[PDB]
Subunit: 223 residues, 6 copies
């Protein structure tokens, strides 16, 4: 297992990356979160510009990494982290636009399951429709933590799309189906976690209504 | 709306079926839960065999109903209960064959999510892949009860198939994907609940490898 | 295969079920047909309320049985009947909504074929699109009987839907394609029969009109046609 | 106002209410020479010769349709929608999937499995089953029975390719025989509310035209 | 090779068909081109009414034949030509309707790519979406020719439809597809699969909003 | 070309700062190397998400170079913006690829006349059939001319835009004559067509997906992409 490190996308040696990785798309947010919350910060990756740091938050060892944009981008990083680097738990953190009209800006969405456009599923030769879900233990602790620090949260279904810019109007059906917010990464993360028998959770803060450090604290309490 | 009750599939009048319904496939099993766990029992449905009872369990009014076999069947019932009879919570109970090799017989599986073959998803004109999930609050309440009442349980993904009898084998990929157990109803329920903004949980007892204990876990969620 | 009888869905022993089984979704409709048309009736199944009876009609032994609603439900029963109980012929008799505007309430519809929403064709691993068809001989015998008894009937395509309540309007394209009536079970039955090399036919009475104002005891004429096909 | 078309040379009325089609322009010319009186060519375009004559009194036309579902699609549509054809009977050779079919047996396509044709053009929200018209079907079985010919009636499969292991599941399902044209015809006739049947003589096994020509012509009205 | 000639669709003996075939649907266009441009004209095929001709263009061997209508039809001929007759190039020449508003009647369209309705892609067992492209060399040579002779042309994507009679043109137009016909894609697929060369060129005859082509095509004689 | 929408959430550049030709690679490091190596009067216009972008001059002609991340949704975002907000005319992608075709050697350039693909965003275009993703023909022809004239080993044909890096589904692609696998082309091609602009994806073979599976020496993956850059650069106008 350690034999396949480093990877073509990650310059770190085995053991260099903690058992709990927090991930965001932005390397600037990853670089910030590390500087803001972690002592003894050590950079393990810079390959592909995708920074990764290991450090300490309230005693527990913890790593952060950027994942770039889209299911195939996160797909690569997650696969390596789980299958090559002995990662047990990934929590993704990022921004989202809301489909649920009752959501206010700055609300925390917890991705219990993820709808998606086609990405990885065809690689698994699955003879039906596969539902992407987060790890329940992780999901539960985020809800507990969210309700402890008194933050407005919503827990349920999200949609990992392939587009940022819709050509037509497609948000209709998802909205009717009760999908909460749109992003572009979660479903691949869930699929990869499932296949690895590992823990994964996606958490989102609402940045655009389609009708920020507060989220980080919830995430951090999960390490 | 009360206007649409009775339905062609349910002879109960509006108000007669409580806000929490506990469902199972077998009408005989439903009658056992009623005769066993419920006081002041009144039969509200006998249409097409699918019996339905309303009564009391530790103070709260609570109803139990049969749903037949397969997604279109639970589909019809779940739709009417959510959309006509003002039901807010359906917790489904049943037996299942295990895909996860770590499961023992009599284990309780909690359906956080449901894989499925096509049913009436195409009826919702969804421009992508929809994922059927249970209501989180119910899910947590069951996980709480399982860890409270000291029972072996796993929580996660299940598969609602359209067949009981396979031609060849298709269980391989599901097992590779970490699907916990196979049944035939959950996905439609979750899907229909989501569309109504209503609560739904599917809870399974392992009968096959590829009962009273579970009923209590359910009853604690009403 | 006597070894697999009884099943988890059927408490009948091998040989307790006749070689021709008529099926309806409603267990109450089943119990009526048995009381109205059959003599020497024995109940063979009560499992899951899916009542089944064996009896005689004009000398010929036959069974009648409930299947519940939906393709996976009939799928379970038909599979066992064809493969475990040695059944040769299944005739489904049900209600249906009219797509064809010349059909009136009470008209019989004979389903030479069935369009469908996905049931378990993907489980058969079919590399293309499968057309579900009834047995020709049964089909022919039904039309003849309807002709001889002078009941208004249509013979053609029907649609096996997975939904009862449409979340919109999907009926249009079907109606354009000459589909006669909608129901919920046939395609799965046809498919399973084909695979077993046995005989299936689904016959319907129009109980609802899915056009015009929607106008919503007459199931008797259909039971007679079905009953005549028993061998 | 629609006749002639860019694929069919005839003006309206030149084609009878019953048409019989085969793939090969020779079998079409033969059929006329063999069974028809007062034969007249209506079509010459694309080399798809059409003939109008009389069989035992009744007006009848015979015509080539080329190869594949899109090809038959073009003629069948034109025939049904512009020319007022009521009945179309395809007569073809085919290869047997069913082990018990022997060479020269008649198969009558009550139903047709398919590779994707122009179903996608009809906006059908589900799987559509292509069925033959029941009446022609009943008449052909009766005719085969009365004349004492070996025949089977059931499902056939309209493939998009001639040269291929895509057959196992088809065989498993009891499909009798493979050809390339039936399904599109069934769809178009259904869509037009008209009558269609595809009958085949078994020429190959995948494991005597005259007799079939006779069954066919008895379907003319 | 030799033991498959003639075939049950093509009556020609091996060698009787040149290394470059030009194909069209209308058997009239096939005979006319031979009569117009070729020396030493000899007919080979007559089966199915699919006339075939081998002669000389400017001192190289060249054949011309009909392919009927539809991807299944061209599929049969292109397959046989490529795999049994040792053909190396097939250039289809045809009429087509314009999607692109800027295309004028008589303009040449060169099919660098073909969009399609399902043909027999399903036959190859392809686990993704396959793009049908032309051979680059023939494609580039046809442009050079269109330039040197100064005829109006565009090069881009075309769409090989299964139907002649329909309104599904909108999204195709949005995607910048140049024109519709019925044969190109299957031709591209079979050529690709056989590691040989294929190009479809079309004269615009309809607007959905032949000699000048022949010369460009013949210039691809080798 | 819509000045109102610039900068974007993914691109900090104002309108006019990005040239009419943009060359694109996945790695921000390779992009910076290309700029330092071939361009003069270089200005950085973007640093958002580490998606570095530079504008400079090559033999007199203004052009831009930019990181596009990994995957079709990633290139999709950038190409969409460049084509539709920045007034870009030409996008040439230049990447590494694995060889499916057995006659290809490590170092060979592959010109993607067409791109097969796993579903990206074709479903958002509501296309009622199967869509073939093609390069712009002029750009394609210009790349072949340049390679032939410069005498570099090249092959032009079909490529495959996979959605996965870690898979044996490759066989059917191989039988269909697909040359090489990468991860971005189909989306770029798709977006160009819809915009009516020009795209081309060029690749260097860094991995052989057959035989012993010889992969490029650590030096060459950072140093043998030179010849392809020279071809790509010559296409700038």
């Amino acid at each position: 297992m350690a034999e396949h490190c480093p990877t073509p996308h990650n310059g770190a040696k085995y053991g260099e990356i903690a058992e709990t990785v927090l991930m965001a798309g932005d390397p600037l947010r990853v670089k910030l979160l590390a500087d803001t919350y972690l002592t003894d910060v050590v950079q393990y990756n810079s390959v592909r510009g995708a920074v990764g740091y290991t450090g300490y938050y309230k005693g527990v060892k913890l790593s952060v990494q950027a994942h770039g944009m889209g299911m195939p981008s996160i797909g690569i990083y997650a696969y390596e982290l789980f299958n090559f680097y002995g990662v047990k738990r990934i929590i993704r953190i990022g921004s989202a636009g809301a489909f649920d009209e009752s959501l206010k800006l700055g609300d925390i969405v917890i991705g219990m399951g993820a709808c998606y456009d086609s990405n990885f599923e065809r690689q698994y030769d699955i003879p039906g429709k596969y539902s992407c879900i987060a790890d329940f233990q992780l999901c539960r602790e985020a809800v507990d933590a969210a309700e402890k620090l008194g933050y407005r949260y919503k827990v349920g279904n999200i949609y990992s799309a392939n587009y940022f810019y819709d050509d037509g109007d497609h948000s209709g059906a998802w909205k009717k189906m009760g999908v909460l917010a749109v992003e572009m990464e979660a479903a691949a993360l869930y699929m990869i976690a499932a296949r690895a028998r590992k823990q994964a959770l996606c958490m989102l803060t609402i940045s655009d209504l389609c009708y920020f450090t507060q989220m980080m604290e919830v995430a951090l309490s999960l390490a």
